Design goal:
This is part of a larger assembly, with three copies of chain A. The first copy, chain A, is mainly alpha-helical. The first copy, chain A, has helices at about 5-40, 50. The PDB classes it as membrane protein, toxin.
């Protein structure tokens, strides 16, 4: 009876933490894109060659 | 004289990169 | 005078390498 309640407590925490990781993923992809395309705009210390190469 | 203007350009580019990141974080 | 321009070239190359790694990490 104790293990059959521990098993339910594990299953519900599993289904909640999977959705929180699935939202963490999408919030983290946008941070990678922000950092990359914001750092690539600093290739104006050279000409447009330095812009396309960034 | 080429080495000194390349050294000053490197220091200027480092300062410009820091200022760009500082303004962009705001 | 050769020793001083080699010393300045070494210091300039060190600064350029640091600036390259700093921009590439961004």
């Amino acid at each position: 009876n104790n293990a059959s309640g521990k098993l339910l407590a594990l299953d519900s925490q599993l289904t909640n933490d999977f959705s929180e990781k699935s939202s963490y993923f999408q919030s983290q992809v946008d941070k990678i894109r922000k950092e990359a395309y914001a750092g690539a705009a600093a290739g104006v210390v050279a000409g447009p060659f330095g812009l396309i190469i960034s | 004289k080429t080495v000194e203007v390349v050294k000053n350009a490197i220091e200027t580019a480092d300062g410009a990169l820091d200022l760009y990141n500082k303004y962009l974080d705001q």
